[PDB]
Design a protein around this motif. Structure first.
Motif, mmCIF file in Angstrom:
data_model
loop_
_atom_site.group_PDB
_atom_site.id
_atom_site.type_symbol
_atom_site.label_atom_id
_atom_site.label_comp_id
_atom_site.label_asym_id
_atom_site.label_seq_id
_atom_site.Cartn_x
_atom_site.Cartn_y
_atom_site.Cartn_z
ATOM 1 N N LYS A 1 -3.064 -1.898 -6.900
ATOM 2 C CA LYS A 1 -1.794 -1.310 -6.483
ATOM 3 C C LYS A 1 -1.572 -1.473 -4.985
ATOM 4 C CE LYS A 1 0.140 0.228 -10.222
ATOM 5 N NZ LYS A 1 1.426 -0.378 -10.666
ATOM 6 N N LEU B 1 9.583 2.639 -6.456
ATOM 7 C CA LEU B 1 8.224 3.073 -6.783
ATOM 8 C C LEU B 1 8.315 4.363 -7.593
ATOM 9 C CD1 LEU B 1 6.413 2.272 -3.422
ATOM 10 C CD2 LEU B 1 6.327 0.976 -5.561
ATOM 11 N N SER B 2 8.347 4.230 -8.915
ATOM 12 C CA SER B 2 8.400 5.384 -9.802
ATOM 13 C C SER B 2 6.981 5.891 -10.059
ATOM 14 C CB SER B 2 9.125 5.023 -11.096
ATOM 15 O OG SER B 2 9.374 6.179 -11.877
ATOM 16 N N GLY B 3 6.847 6.860 -10.962
ATOM 17 C CA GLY B 3 5.554 7.400 -11.308
ATOM 18 C C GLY B 3 5.561 8.911 -11.436
ATOM 19 N N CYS C 1 1.170 11.382 -7.219
ATOM 20 C CA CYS C 1 0.274 10.243 -7.372
ATOM 21 C C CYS C 1 0.205 9.408 -6.097
ATOM 22 C CB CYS C 1 0.695 9.378 -8.558
ATOM 23 S SG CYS C 1 2.354 8.683 -8.439
ATOM 24 N N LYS D 1 2.554 8.663 -3.613
ATOM 25 C CA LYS D 1 3.627 7.692 -3.421
ATOM 26 C C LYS D 1 3.990 7.550 -1.946
ATOM 27 C CE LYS D 1 5.917 9.225 -7.653
ATOM 28 N NZ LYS D 1 5.897 10.636 -7.180
ATOM 29 N N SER D 2 4.457 8.640 -1.331
ATOM 30 C CA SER D 2 5.045 8.558 0.005
ATOM 31 C C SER D 2 4.008 8.200 1.062
ATOM 32 C CB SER D 2 5.727 9.880 0.353
ATOM 33 O OG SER D 2 6.670 10.245 -0.639
ATOM 34 N N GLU E 1 12.819 8.983 0.094
ATOM 35 C CA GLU E 1 12.084 10.026 -0.607
ATOM 36 C C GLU E 1 12.927 11.294 -0.696
ATOM 37 O OE1 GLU E 1 8.501 11.256 1.293
ATOM 38 O OE2 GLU E 1 9.526 12.474 2.803
ATOM 39 N N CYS F 1 11.620 6.146 -3.577
ATOM 40 C CA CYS F 1 10.566 6.809 -4.333
ATOM 41 C C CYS F 1 11.207 7.769 -5.326
ATOM 42 C CB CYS F 1 9.608 7.554 -3.403
ATOM 43 S SG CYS F 1 9.031 6.582 -1.992
ATOM 44 N N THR G 1 10.328 10.369 -8.659
ATOM 45 C CA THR G 1 9.296 11.092 -9.390
ATOM 46 C C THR G 1 9.693 11.211 -10.857
ATOM 47 O OG1 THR G 1 8.571 12.346 -7.453
ATOM 48 C CG2 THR G 1 8.077 13.263 -9.621
ATOM 49 N N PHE H 1 3.800 3.622 -10.706
ATOM 50 C CA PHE H 1 2.549 4.196 -10.233
ATOM 51 C C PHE H 1 1.858 4.964 -11.351
ATOM 52 C CE2 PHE H 1 3.749 4.399 -5.454
ATOM 53 C CZ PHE H 1 3.443 3.058 -5.347
#
Ligand SMILES: Nc1ncnc2c1ncn2[C@@H]1O[C@H](COP(=O)(O)OP(=O)(O)OP(O)(O)=S)[C@@H](O)[C@H]1O
Ligand SMILES: Nc1ncnc2c1ncn2[C@@H]1O[C@H](COP(=O)(O)OP(=O)(O)OP(O)(O)=S)[C@@H](O)[C@H]1O
Ligand SMILES: Nc1ncnc2c1ncn2[C@@H]1O[C@H](COP(=O)(O)OP(=O)(O)OP(O)(O)=S)[C@@H](O)[C@H]1O
Ligand SMILES: [Mg+2]
Ligand SMILES: [Mg+2]
Ligand SMILES: [Mg+2]
Lengths: 292, 162, 266, 317, 405
Positions: free
Chosen positions: E22, E45-47, E51, E53-54, E102, E137, E139, E175
DNA sequence: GCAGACACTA
């Protein structure tokens, strides 16, 4: 006809009705007809009651033919009346004569408008089934907390400045001093912080102000009265104080407040309800900022 | 005038002595109101058992001439949206009583027909504004009521009349 | 601090504070012995609006930085005090009421901003907004007065600004051309899936490089006509070095108010 | 003007609160140390969640409770913009607190709050985590979004046992000086079924209506809970006994048929000593009866037929 | 005091709990973006929640910006975001500041989400020289009970209407939850940082099982750190409660079909699934998923009687107007019969989404074609035949009659 | 819960 009334100057009637539109526009006004004149009362959520009174000499053809106990009630929707009157009463100096009619009971409220050879006639059917009667948020004058008379323009300016700030909760202060430096203000708290609008001791807008000791005869100095009133009632009353000459403030130890509006002119009296309790122990910090 | 009404409405009880069958509930509520203590009564039972009649008779007994401006009666005929409920009951409960030195009674007929958020707002007001304001809940169905409401309100069961 | 003014400067003060509130919701107000400083840094780090109020703006400047005990974070050594307050909170306070006038206005800080309003009559209004004492971040001012020559009239420019339909929120293109300044305000068309016009291109131009914001420019120019300046009150200026990368510099000189503006280009 | 026993004896300190002894002790250490993290409290309603949060805030603040708390409840203007502005204004102020103390914001009943308001709340906590703290009060943690639960510490609340409720009842009885009986207290506990507020209300009704707390008086004023009767009649062997039990309890005491069906569905879902096939067949029959009642056929005959079918599938001829 | 997840914020790239693959993928994507030839205009960038991300973008922009502040985070409306995007458009030279989206603005209303979509489309197709880098980003977490997208599952596919995702100038990298090994390593790092406080109490000897349970119970590093902090601060004898996660749409079908390894008994598993995920198991187009996925238990090699009983029970459940009792009965029956037939189960087939949207699209195409045929026939002469008879007689005979003539 | 393919050091 049991009740009849005629007027030629509808500007006074429409500017009196414009003071009732912020909350009373919905429905459920209980008009009273008696020897004194014509009165309208509005009460929503049992939190505030307004009374707008029209005298005998306001009408030009007051007859009042009746053979009863001399108290008949009727409830009509305000919104229908406003929708009907919005289109008429147009322009200026239209000499629109308004005729009032009511045939005692079971008959609609009848209004006749004539404007330059053009007549109109609207019938307002009433609602008198679940009229519980009595009602009224009245107070006794033997235990008035304090009395105050203020100018209409100053109160209107104060309310129009307070409205756009926010201040969902408002406070009322009363204070008298030996050196004739009477203190009267309507402070409030909002997300902005603290908002303090102050009415000075000048007799131009504070002609009379005395704090009583619950007996309405024993005036005292050095005692503070705290009144916790919601923003809603003050917002509703702001429009009613837009045009006025003198405003009278009078609340008792029970917390209910009666405000009289003077605008001869007609008299408008409104009864208010105080909150159950002050927020924690705020009243202390109200004075602590007041002599600060 | 009377003698021109249906017998259901003509024979509506006006006093607590006029309510038959539920002797235990009547005695309990009389003992509650004799001590000046109203613990957020909740009434449940089949229709026709005399719930709203009992609460009306109780309000007449404990208030008298104060029914016109102290009792707030809400029901299915009136809109009970979330904003409407929160505004109306908050304004009614937050305001102090005019002159009577007694608790404020609010009657909610057909309380089963309200949304979950409205019930949550009502149950928050019940615990928050309770120094002077009490609540009455009337509902024939308990499955449509939030279980939190049944905990804060004392449940009284109306048996079928013997 | 206790600064009192009794003149017709309430209009320009309210206009400046409304400009700062529109630029950023939170306004950082720093007070120093030299003058009065008010600014609001942009969220995108592309706008630096500076307004200065000299000691002649007010009638008294009784400021005591040494007596400040609470809020030492904003007190740093010329010692000065810095604090931040919401713009919308103060703009609705410094407003001019309709049908009435204000004869006395002042702002003070206690040990909870102490700001009061005294109208023409005896009635007074007092407000206590909450501030936060931040770390005298004046490096932006250091870059602003770190330091071509272009001067033009401001009233026709303001007319161009307020008749150009800023609702679509287009961009402005300063076309110097050869000698005459041709102010242009148009938006760039965007292609769709197959040469489609997703956003309509509304273009308008007139004749009397660098591309910058439109609402910042309008807000900066609104300060001028708000105050009646019979004496001095010269037109705005535009300063910018070579290449579009560096930000631009503007200044509007007034006898009691100093205007500065920095807008990052490209 | 006497307050009801539920509200007259609201605990003011964490020591008076009974139930989860470990959680109460942990709250006491949090109050003493002052390190207050973001918390979410969920469990059965009316077990002392909001009361515990209020007691913890009081013990942590003291004289700072006047301004250091912003108790936003469900019965408020719980929107997306005004709530965000209010929380931002609350978080953009500082008071004279010790370095080990932080501001506490209480949001009771966060389940019904809109998801956009949850995102605004997340933005406020991310922006102003150093100054203020948030304490959540709710019944279940499912309604709270995952990112908000990530930035907090979850403390699940269990149902109050017999010992804690009995101890609280004894303290309240000693405070009120009321004659009581052990059998009456056992009946009160049995009717409450782990609820504290319901137990207090039942005790108040018993003392007001009859005086002495006895099992007979408690049974007279309030009947036994309907889930217990449903469970008793559902596991009955003979059809006749179950029919008689359902009739003489539910129809004689005046219980609505749809309520009976819903309670039976909940009992079958929570049943343990039954096979999977029998449980799913009974669930299907419950659904059919619920549809019949919802359409309008909710007589006693439908309930009798449902019990007959349940017993037929139980016995399998 | 200060929170552990904020006090122990990573400083170097190696501290971030990110997978090597990743990290390499996001580094390559960013490096492609910062070249003058921009392959991808935006980075999505999902997920799941928490996890890491930022922080990946934060330290990456920390380490790359001086090579050629750190970020410009947008505070959480409509015209404010439009102005923010326009200002970010004019930040390319001498700054090279990455644009972070974000905590995206409100999208639960139709108007704001639509204007967000047109803003994204406008900036994606802008033919302007150079490009400021931009990272979005999102979520992935479903909205609990309080339609057509929002209020059912909040994720990247809900906000974007299959147009932004299907764009050449985008790099969608989903992600995964934080790895158990990485979580254990980071918890051990926190413990060796807090050695003194760990030795203050009697928690060092009872650490391994707690760390293993925390790592294996949840995949959120922030929630794990908060739980570890709460456990360490507590004196002891306090059970730990974690951040209860969510079950995906296909995960629910997999649990219903095969079962659950943690809970052997079916009743408790079904009750927990119904309680925690009532919205997913009560919303529509889920029984279709079971009806289309039950064939993959043994690659379609089970008894026909079990399948017939399954579909019959599903029909009875559909007859109950989607009642919760119907859903419970259907799920319990499916689980029971699969548990019964799982005595011989190997090489289970892959699952898929039911083909419901394609049928609706084809039906809409048939409807508009029939409307056009009616319009042209009515223009030519007088011919009305309602709509029911078209599909039976005029849907086939009239096309060939017209073609032959 | 399943499969298909890759990670990583014993
Ligand atoms: N205990 C009683 N004794 C005599 N008549 C009664 C009694 N209870 C009810 N009634 C009669 O029933 C009529 C209607 O009862 P209500 O109390 O108005 O309705 P209810 O019983 O509350 O049922 P609902 O569906 O909840 S409104 C009354 O007007 C009385 O005539
Ligand atoms: N452990 C306890 N000890 C003593 N009294 C308690 C206890 N728990 C609850 N009570 C009483 O029950 C009342 C209600 O408690 P609450 O905290 O309001 O209930 P809750 O746990 O918040 O659940 P809700 O309000 O239904 S969402 C309190 O005011 C106390 O009088
Ligand atoms: N070793 C670590 N690796 C990554 N994050 C860490 C670490 N230690 C602490 N953290 C914290 O864990 C959080 C992870 O941040 P992110 O997950 O990237 O933010 P996020 O994507 O907004 O999370 P959500 O989905 O909004 S709750 C940050 O607050 C970090 O400070
Ligand atoms: Mg009733
Ligand atoms: Mg609570
Ligand atoms: Mg983050």
């Amino acid at each position: 006809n049991k009740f009849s009334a005629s007027t030629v100057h509808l500007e006074h009637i429409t500017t009196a009705l414009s003071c009732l539109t912020p909350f009373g526009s919905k429905d459920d006004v209980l008009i009273f007809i008696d020897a004194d004149g014509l009165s309208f009362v509005r009460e929503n959520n049992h939190v505030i009651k307004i009374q707008l009174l029209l005298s005998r000499e306001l009408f030009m053809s007051y007859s009042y033919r009746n053979e009863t106990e001399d108290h008949m009630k009727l409830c009509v929707k305000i919104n229908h009346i406003l929708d009907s009157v919005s289109v008429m009463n147009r322009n200026s100096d239209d000499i629109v004569e308004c005729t009032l009619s009511y045939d005692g009971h079971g008959s609609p409220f009848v209004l006749i408008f004539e404007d330059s050879f053009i007549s109109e006639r609207v019938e307002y059917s009433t609602y008198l089934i679940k009229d519980f009667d009595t009602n009224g948020l009245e107070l006794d004058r033997e235990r008035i907390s304090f009395e105050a008379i203020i100018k209409g323009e100053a109160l209107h300016s104060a309310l129009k400045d307070l409205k756009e700030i926010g201040c969902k909760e408002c406070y009322v202060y009363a204070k008298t001093e030996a050196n004739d430096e009477n203190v009267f203000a309507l402070i409030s708290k909002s997300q902005l912080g603290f908002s303090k609008i102050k009415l000075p001791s000048n007799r131009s807008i504070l002609e009379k102000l005395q704090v009583f000791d619950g007996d309405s005869t024993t005036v005292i100095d050095g005692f503070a009265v705290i009144g916790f009133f919601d923003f809603t009632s003050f917002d509703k009353i702001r429009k009613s104080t837009k045009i006025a000459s003198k405003v009278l403030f009078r609340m008792d130890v029970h917390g209910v407040l009666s405000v009289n509006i003077l605008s001869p002119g007609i008299v408008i009296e409104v009864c208010m309800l105080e909150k159950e309790s002050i927020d924690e122990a705020a009243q202390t910090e109200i004075e602590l900022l007041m002599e600060t | 005038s009377k003698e021109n009404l249906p017998w259901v409405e003509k024979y509506r009880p006006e006093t607590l002595d006029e309510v038959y069958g539920q002797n235990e509930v009547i005695t309990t509520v009389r003992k509650f109101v004799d001590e000046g203590k109203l613990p957020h009564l909740l009434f449940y039972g089949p229709p026709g058992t005399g719930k709203t009649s009992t609460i009306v008779a109780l309000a007449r007994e404990i208030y008298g001439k104060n029914y016109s401006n102290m009792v707030l009666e809400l029901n299915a005929s009136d809109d009970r949206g979330i904003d409407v409920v929160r505004n109306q009951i908050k304004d009614f409960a937050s305001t102090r009583q005019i002159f009577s030195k007694g608790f404020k009674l609010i009657i909610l007929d057909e309380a089963d027909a309200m949304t979950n958020a409205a019930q949550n707002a009502l149950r928050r007001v019940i615990e928050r504004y309770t120094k002077n304001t009490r609540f009455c809940v009337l509902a024939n169905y308990a499955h449509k009521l939030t279980p939190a409401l049944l905990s804060r309100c004392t449940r009284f069961r109306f048996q079928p009349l013997p | 601090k206790a600064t009192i003014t009794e003149s017709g400067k309430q209009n320009i003060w309210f206009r400046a504070i409304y400009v700062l509130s529109t630029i950023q919701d939170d306004i950082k107000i720093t007070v120093t012995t030299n003058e009065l400083i008010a600014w609001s840094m942009n969220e995108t780090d592309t706008t630096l609006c500076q307004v200065r109020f000299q000691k002649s703006f007010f009638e008294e400047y009784e400021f005591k930085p040494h007596e400040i005990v609470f809020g030492e974070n904003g007190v740093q050594v010329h010692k000065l005090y810095s604090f931040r307050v919401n713009g919308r909170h103060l703009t609705t306070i410094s407003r001019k009421p309709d049908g009435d006038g204000i004869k006395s206005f002042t702002i003070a800080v206690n040990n909870r901003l102490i700001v009061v309003i005294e109208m023409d009559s005896l009635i007074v209004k007092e407000y206590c907004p909450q501030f936060q004492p931040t770390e005298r971040e004046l490096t932006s001012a250091l870059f602003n007065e770190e330091v071509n020559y272009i001067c033009c009239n401001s009233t026709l420019l303001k007319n161009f600004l307020d008749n150009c339909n800023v609702n679509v929120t287009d961009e402005v293109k300063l076309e110097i051309n050869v000698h005459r300044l041709s102010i242009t305000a148009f938006t760039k068309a965007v292609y769709g899936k197959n040469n489609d016009l997703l956003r309509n291109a509304l273009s308008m131009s007139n004749t009397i490089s660098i591309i910058f914001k439109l609402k910042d420019f309008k807000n900066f120019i609104t300060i001028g006509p708000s105050w009646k300046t019979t004496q001095d009150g010269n037109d705005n200026i535009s300063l910018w070095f070579c290449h579009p990368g560096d930000p631009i510099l503007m200044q509007m000189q007034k006898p009691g108010v100093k205007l500065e503006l920095v807008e990052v280009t490209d | 003007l006497q307050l009801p026993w539920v509200e007259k004896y609201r605990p003011q300190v964490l020591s008076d609160i009974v139930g989860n002894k470990e959680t109460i002790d942990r709250l006491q250490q949090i109050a003493k140390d002052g390190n207050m993290p973001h918390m979410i409290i969920s469990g059965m309603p009316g077990i002392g969640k909001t009361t515990s949060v209020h007691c913890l805030a009081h013990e942590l603040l003291g004289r700072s409770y006047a301004d250091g708390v912003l108790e936003l409840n469900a019965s408020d203007d719980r929107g997306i913009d005004v709530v965000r502005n209010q929380i931002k204004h609350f978080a953009q102020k500082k008071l004279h607190l010790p370095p080990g103390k932080h501001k506490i914001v209480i949001l009771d009943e966060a389940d019904s709050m809109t998801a956009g308001a949850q995102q605004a709340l997340r933005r406020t906590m991310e922006l102003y985590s150093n100054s203020t703290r948030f304490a959540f009060a709710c019944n279940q943690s499912n309604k709270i979004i995952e990112p908000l639960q990530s930035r907090c510490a979850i403390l699940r609340y269990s149902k109050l046992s017999d010992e804690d409720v009995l101890k609280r009842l004894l303290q309240i009885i000693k405070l009120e000086d009321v004659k009581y009986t052990n059998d009456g207290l056992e009946a009160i506990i049995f009717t409450a079924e782990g609820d504290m507020r319901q137990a207090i209300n039942n005790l108040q009704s018993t003392v007001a209506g009859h005086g002495l707390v006895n099992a007979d008086n408690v049974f007279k004023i309030v009947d036994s809970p309907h889930p217990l009767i449903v469970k008793k009649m559902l596991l009955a062997s003979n059809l006749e006994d179950s029919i008689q039990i359902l009739r003489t309890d539910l129809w004689k005491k005046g219980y609505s048929s749809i309520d009976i069906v819903t309670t039976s569905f909940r009992v079958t879902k929570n049943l343990a000593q039954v096979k999977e096939s029998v449980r799913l067949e009974m669930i299907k029959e419950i659904g059919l009866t619920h549809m019949r009642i919802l359409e309008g056929v909710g007589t006693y005959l439908q309930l009798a037929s449902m019990l007959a079918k349940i017993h037929k599938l139980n016995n399998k001829a | 005091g200060e929170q552990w997840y904020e006090k122990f914020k990573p400083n170097c790239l190696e501290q971030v709990a990110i997978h090597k693959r990743k990290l390499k993928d996001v580094q390559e994507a960013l490096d492609a973006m910062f070249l003058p030839n921009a392959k991808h205009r935006i980075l999505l960038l999902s997920g799941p929640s928490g996890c890491s991300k930022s922080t990946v973008i934060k330290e990456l922009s920390k380490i790359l910006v001086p090579k050629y502040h750190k970020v410009t985070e947008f505070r959480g409306q409509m015209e404010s975001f439009s102005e923010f995007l326009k200002g970010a458009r004019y930040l390319v030279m001498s700054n090279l500041s990455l644009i972070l989206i974000e905590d995206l603005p409100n999208v639960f209303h139709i108007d704001t989400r639509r204007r967000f979509q047109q803003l994204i489309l406008q900036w994606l197709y802008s033919s302007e020289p150079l490009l400021p880098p931009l990272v979005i980003c999102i979520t992935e977490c479903e909205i609990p009970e309080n339609k057509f997208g929002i209020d059912y599952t909040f994720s990247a596919e809900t906000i974007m209407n299959k147009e932004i995702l299907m764009h050449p100038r985008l790099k969608r990298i989903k992600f995964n939850p934080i790895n158990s090994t990485l979580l254990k390593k980071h918890l051990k790092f926190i413990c060796v940082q807090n050695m003194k406080m760990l030795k203050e109490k009697n928690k060092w000897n009872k650490r391994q099982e707690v760390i293993d349970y925390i790592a294996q119970e949840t995949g959120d590093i922030r929630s794990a750190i908060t739980t570890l902090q709460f456990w360490a601060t507590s004196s002891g004898s306090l059970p730990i409660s974690t951040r209860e996660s969510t079950i995906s749409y296909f995960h629910a079908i997999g649990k219903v079909i095969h079962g659950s390894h943690s809970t052997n008994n079916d009743n408790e598993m079904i009750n927990n699934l119904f309680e925690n995920s009532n919205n997913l198991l009560s919303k529509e187009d889920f029984k279709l998923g079971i009806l289309e996925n039950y064939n993959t238990f043994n690659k379609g090699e089970f008894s026909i009687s079990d399948a017939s009983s399954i579909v019959d029970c599903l029909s009875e459940c559909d007859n109950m107007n989607g009642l919760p009792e119907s859903n419970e009965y259907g799920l319990r029956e499916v689980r029971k019969t699969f548990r019964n037939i799982s005595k011989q189960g190997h090489n289970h087939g892959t699952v898929y989404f039911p083909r419901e949207w394609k049928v609706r699209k084809l039906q809409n195409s048939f409807k508009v074609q029939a409307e056009d045929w009616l319009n042209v026939s009515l223009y030519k002469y007088n011919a009305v035949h309602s709509f029911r008879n078209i599909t039976l007689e005029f849907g086939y005979y009239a096309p060939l009659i017209r073609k032959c003539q």
